[PDB]
């Protein structure tokens, strides 16, 4: 029976449009308000029943690993100076049910390559993925709607998107059938269809619950490819689900998710 | 059938001894002439097999990451110097199909809580420890024998060495019967025994082949000592005399000699 406990975080990213902010640090550290990227990513996994973090690391491997490590020189200074709910901001941000480990991934080759370089740390066990740049704030954790639906089903889900016909050069485009009003059974994926030859209008996010299967698909190059061949071994399912994506990729996107959840979670209005 | 393929290497000493060394860079990066002490057991563990390297890390966790990780700058500046065989012993000091993860342990909480730390990368498969300070030079690599005999008498392993009976206290000391000329089968263990009263003088040093077993007896309640004594009852556990020369680099006394003896051996250094 399938359980999710590991979660892995591609966090070497180079965020070449967010340069020069990423010069010394990983994109996925960039803060919407006051939490970084991953931290957000992070804390949905922990609420979908994720204990085991592995971070793949590249470029400034330093900023992920201060952040998600303990810090007693600033725990110092903040009990010195008796804040309650400022030490629980910092020593509180894992539960002590989680652990963190980092792999440094070999070169920038992409997310399939990402992927693999968790294969030590995961062994035979399905797992999750998560891309911080796709910030999604949701009533119900989104990985845990993806989890619930990979234990049902018994395959791998990947987290879908209705997107208009217009943008779909834009992602990775699913061909599937229905199986639920929500979940889809994937028969083939293509990057960037132009928008009258698109599948489908259901793009990839980066919420991903994978089998171990994946590994040696990825071992024979790009996910998308690892995961179009998984699908001829075992079951691939897309799941449409309940919430809202920032794109945080583009300086639009991040700009967009900084206004709306400046709004929605600080009260912060532009002038 | 038992596959080794993991071993977890503690990399968080204090070496209090080494201060002010030491404190900037854990004790097991301090080297023995031109090699830092746990690229040794690293080696050791590699020609023994092991494909996966877990580093168990605590303050000043950058100098092992920055050792074992990649480093392009300086294959640059040694390109521009003149270099090129020394691009090989940077490159390669890791074989191409061996990789290196790090998870930092909550607290200086021992042995048995590092080894406990390794358990999420570890999963259920047996698995090495190997202590840095424990500098062995062997004909065979120590980690070698200790998993050939894992394998063959399916249980863990203690790589184990006679000691004076005046120097019990510095170790866990195992009783033990003969199973062949070099390997026992462990009926008890002992922390740190008084001379007279040590059952033995067969002291385990830092090498250890352990079923994954292990980790539900130091998270029962947290001494490496204890979980072994408990796996015992439910589990095989021997002892194995390793083939080879053993260095307790935990000392001043003992790093002074390995530098020495290997300096001697392998550098053609002798004191003047
Ligand atoms: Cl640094
Ligand atoms: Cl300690
Ligand atoms: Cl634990």
Avoid: W
């Amino acid at each position: 029976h399938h359980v999710v406990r590991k979660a892995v975080f591609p966090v070497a990213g180079m965020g070449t449009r967010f340069l020069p902010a990423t010069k010394a640090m990983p994109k996925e550290m960039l803060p919407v308000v006051d939490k970084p990227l991953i931290q957000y990513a992070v804390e949905e996994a922990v609420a979908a029943g994720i204990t085991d973090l592995i971070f793949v690391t590249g470029r400034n491997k330093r900023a992920i690993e201060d952040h998600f490590d303990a810090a007693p020189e600033l725990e110092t200074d903040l009990e010195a100076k008796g804040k309650h709910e400022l030490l629980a901001l910092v020593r509180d941000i894992l539960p002590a049910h989680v652990n963190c480990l980092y792999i440094r991934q070999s070169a920038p080759l992409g997310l399939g390559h990402a992927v693999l370089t968790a294969a030590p740390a995961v062994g035979n066990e399905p797992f999750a993925v998560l891309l911080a740049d796709d910030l999604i704030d949701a009533d119900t954790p989104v990985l845990k709607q993806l989890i619930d639906v990979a234990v049902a089903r018994q395959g791998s889900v990947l987290g879908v998107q209705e997107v208009p016909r217009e943008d779909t050069r834009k992602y990775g485009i699913v061909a599937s059938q229905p199986v639920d009003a929500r979940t889809e059974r994937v028969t083939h994926i293509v990057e960037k269809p132009a928008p009258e030859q698109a599948p489908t209008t259901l793009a990839v996010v980066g919420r991903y619950v994978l089998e171990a299967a994946i590994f040696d698909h990825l071992r024979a190059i790009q996910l998308t490819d690892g995961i179009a061949a998984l699908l001829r071994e075992r079951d691939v399912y897309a799941h449409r689900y309940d919430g809202k994506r920032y794109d945080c990729g583009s300086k639009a996107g991040m700009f967009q998710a900084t206004v709306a959840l400046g709004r929605k979670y600080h009260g912060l209005i532009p002038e």
